[PDB]
Amino acid sequence: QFAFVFPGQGSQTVGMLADMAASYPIVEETFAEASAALGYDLWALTQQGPAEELNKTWQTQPALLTASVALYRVWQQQGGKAPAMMAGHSLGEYSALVCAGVIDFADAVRLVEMRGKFMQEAVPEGTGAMAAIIGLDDASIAKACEEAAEGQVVSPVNFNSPGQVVIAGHKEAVERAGAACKAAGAKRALPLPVSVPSHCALMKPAADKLAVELAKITFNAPTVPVVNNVDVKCETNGDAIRDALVRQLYNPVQWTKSVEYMAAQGVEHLYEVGPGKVLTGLTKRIVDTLTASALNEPSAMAAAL
């Protein structure tokens, strides 16, 4: 039994899905529905860039959501069975929720565009930072972050695997926290091309505004279980899912535990339904008997079907 996992911001690249689109017309059909909802040509953006445009997060998010949904749609169209469960990393949670039938596709597309805008404006450029902490246990990182905060905000924001954790917050505190992490034994503290300090308390006022938009959108019951980032819970009540998306934005993404949870439910393989191979690469680092592979190239897609 397999699950579908859906990647988040960082997995996009200019040219993504080009080959899948050439094998499967539904890809561009899907991107055209999205483009109609956004008022610009999403496909052309993903194929032509430039990268700097594709990496603006109010454009990244709809781009990635649409990419993942298109891949899902290819799977379904070609007779693929439903996954036992789904989970999506950050933005990817929206993708899962679309594919599980909870949010209308066009609704989600507009939604994550607004999400992106709320996030971007949350904090002035140059006030926030993210760092990748490499080779330190979760708990030592939390302590390091607590000690370093000193009335500013910094905390773990992605638990991606054992020994791979992202922190974020105010620039200065993220610096303090990196250093404390090194002092505690971390192999690396690598600064990321971030700005937007997502998934810490700085996103609150963005989350409040997201809540207002989410309430405008019909949420349906999921047709397959979706394990959420915030609680590692499969909610089925629309308003509970809604609430989980709000809380998701200013709380850490529990990817490690979500992947452990899926394995604990009997899942044996994760298909990454999205561009890139980020989540695929995490998988074995979380549970070394779990396998994973990506479904963004036609051959892989065929081999899996």
Burial group, residue 243, by CB count within 10 angstroms (0-12, 13-18, 19+)? middle
Sign of the Cα torsion 137, 119, 114, 13 reads: negative
- CB under 8 Å, gap of 24 or more: what pairs does 123-127 form? 123/196, 123/197, 123/202, 125/195, 126/171, 126/195, 127/170, 127/171
Structure tokens at 115: 């999400």
Per CATH, is 1-122+196-305 categorized as 3.40.366.10? yes
Report the C-alpha dihedral over residues 213, 218, 223, 227, rounded to 10 degrees. Answer: 20
- The domain spans of the chain are 1-122+196-305, 123-195
Which whole-number Å values give the CA distances from 233 to 69, 186, 283, in the listed order? 22, 30, 19
Q: Are 26 and 74 in contact (CB under 8 A)?
A: yes
The CA distance from 302 to 305, in Å, is: 5
Q: How large is the C-alpha radius of gyration of the chain?
A: 18
| Residue among 51, 49, 48 nearest 193 (CA) | 51
The CA distance from 305 to 298, in Å, is: 10
Residue tagged active-site, from 35, 90, 195, 258 = 90
User: What b/e sequence results for 116-142 when a residue is b if at least 16 CB atoms lie within 10 Å of its CB, and e otherwise?
Assistant: bbbbeebbeeeebbbbbbeebebebbe
Q: Does 90 qualify as catalytic in the annotation?
A: yes
Breaks (C-N over 2.5 A) in the chain follow: none
Q: Is 268 helix (H, G, I), strand (E, B) or coil?
A: coil
| Residue among 90, 83, 84 nearest 12 (CA) | 90
Q: Which helix (H) or strand (E) holds 129?
A: strand 128-134
**Structural biology method used:** X-ray
Please enumerate in sequence order all residues whose Cβ is within 8 A of that of 75, keeping only pairs 6 or more positions apart, or say none. Answer: 273, 295, 301, 305
Please enumerate in sequence order all residues whose Cβ is within 8 A of that of 70, keeping only pairs 6 or more positions apart, or say none. Answer: 17, 20, 26, 27, 30, 31
The CA distance from 186 to 139, in Å, is: 12
DSSP state of 83: P
Residue tagged active-site, from 95, 170, 199, 258 = 199
Burial group, residue 92, by CB count within 10 angstroms (0-12, 13-18, 19+)? buried
Q: Are 188 and 164 in contact (CB under 8 A)?
A: no
Q: Are 227 and 86 in contact (CB under 8 A)?
A: yes
Q: Does 199 qualify as catalytic in the annotation?
A: yes
Q: Are 269 and 11 in contact (CB under 8 A)?
A: no
**What's the CATH fold of domain 123-195?**
Alpha-Beta Plaits (3.30.70)
